[PDB]
Write a protein that binds this ligand. Sequence first.
Ligand SMILES: COc1cc(/C=C/c2cc(O)cc(O)c2)ccc1O
Ligand SMILES: COc1cc(/C=C/c2cc(O)cc(O)c2)ccc1O
Ligand code: NA
Ligand code: NA
Ligand code: NA
Ligand code: NA
Lengths: 116, 116, 116, 116
Amino acid sequence: CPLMVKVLDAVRGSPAINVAMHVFRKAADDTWEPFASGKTSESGELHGLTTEEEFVEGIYKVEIDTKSYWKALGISPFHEHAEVVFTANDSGPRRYTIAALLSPYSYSTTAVVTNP
Amino acid sequence: CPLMVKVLDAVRGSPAINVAMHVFRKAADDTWEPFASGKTSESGELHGLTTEEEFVEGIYKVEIDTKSYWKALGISPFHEHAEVVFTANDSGPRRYTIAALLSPYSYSTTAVVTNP
Amino acid sequence: CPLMVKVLDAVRGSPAINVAMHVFRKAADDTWEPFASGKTSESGELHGLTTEEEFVEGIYKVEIDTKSYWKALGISPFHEHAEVVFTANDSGPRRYTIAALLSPYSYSTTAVVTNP
Amino acid sequence: CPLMVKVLDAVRGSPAINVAMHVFRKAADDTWEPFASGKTSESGELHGLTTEEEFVEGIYKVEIDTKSYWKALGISPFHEHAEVVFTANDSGPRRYTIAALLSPYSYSTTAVVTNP
Ligand SMILES: COc1cc(/C=C/c2cc(O)cc(O)c2)ccc1O
Ligand SMILES: COc1cc(/C=C/c2cc(O)cc(O)c2)ccc1O
Ligand code: NA
Ligand code: NA
Ligand code: NA
Ligand code: NA
């Protein structure tokens, strides 16, 4: 899995399930080109976003729709979304896990980057 | 001060000093318009970005240049920047403090929103 | 103020007000001796816990009563408390700010250490 | 797995491998009784700490030796250890994953609690 995203709920102590996100890749004109998307599973994980051959050097943005997640729980959150912007594959392929821990007024994110 | 940003360094246990950031506001055509910018002080704080009159309802993005901060310390970090996107003042004027806690592969961010 | 603690609420986007905490110092017999205690103010800050003369080298524990805070809001939280254990002043006098960002099932904590 | 601990390194973007920890359970005299222990694997995970039958209601403390982890990397960290103190199994068995994200001057922790 070249790119996986895992989302956790800090209020309820659970995976954040059915969280939608889009992934973009920065184009030469500095616009954000659509790249991948999906929703987290019952484990809070989104696998299968891309393949090693398609996932080359670039600046990538994961835009996680945290607002819809909190709204469905009756909570008015601070952020429009949580976004994670990073350069990937600049030294050749790596495997990336992006984790996000969500609260209504806060989020934390980290990356685990592994060499295949 | 209707908007203040405070940035902390989780590696060195210090304020994150001289961190550049840019604030944008979403325009009617869904474009990000430049709104304000500045650098954190010796306390890790950036004051004076805007005024009560100028800080109208809208969707704002604070883009913190974490990459340059880490690179100046000899660290090749994961993120291009740490960004915070939020609706402001849609229920009347509020004061916002955005805090960010930085590590090379991770960041946490929260908001303190107060009604004056 | 050689030691200050600041506590923030990630659910409500506010300082965590009236949060009790107890500070202990490790005794020569490896027991935790009571050192100081107090409650956060309306700003989420607790000042005046100790003095430069009293805050000698040692191992200190700050135990923040997060459980009572959440229970007063009707939330059954995960942790009994958030605690921070650290050696202080072993290279000479320093000023310490301990910050904690609270959610029902999660907390983040950092330290800002400055040389006066 | 009734109790699993996962530890991540926010400086290097990797699992925190070979991190030692002890688990204690509060006794009737308010002393901390030894309960379980181990070291994280190459995935940053420590499995097999306990069994469902042995893991009953109590207050548990996971004490993670983060200081030795940072010292081995030549880093002088803030905390003596990271500790996570929580009541478990008060409503009967649950499965607990404790995650900790480590930086030299900061840590974040969350719990994922699932009903079998
Ligand atoms: C708002 O003013 C302050 C915030 C903080 C720390 C905020 C913080 C701490 C964390 O552990 C995580 C996080 O995302 C934010 C410290 C001193 C301040 O004066
Ligand atoms: C539980 O499983 C996993 C948790 C995480 C990340 C947890 C985490 C992330 C943060 O940004 C902050 C925090 O306190 C905890 C990553 C991979 C996993 O498989
Ligand atoms: Na390269
Ligand atoms: Na309105
Ligand atoms: Na000394
Ligand atoms: Na019960």
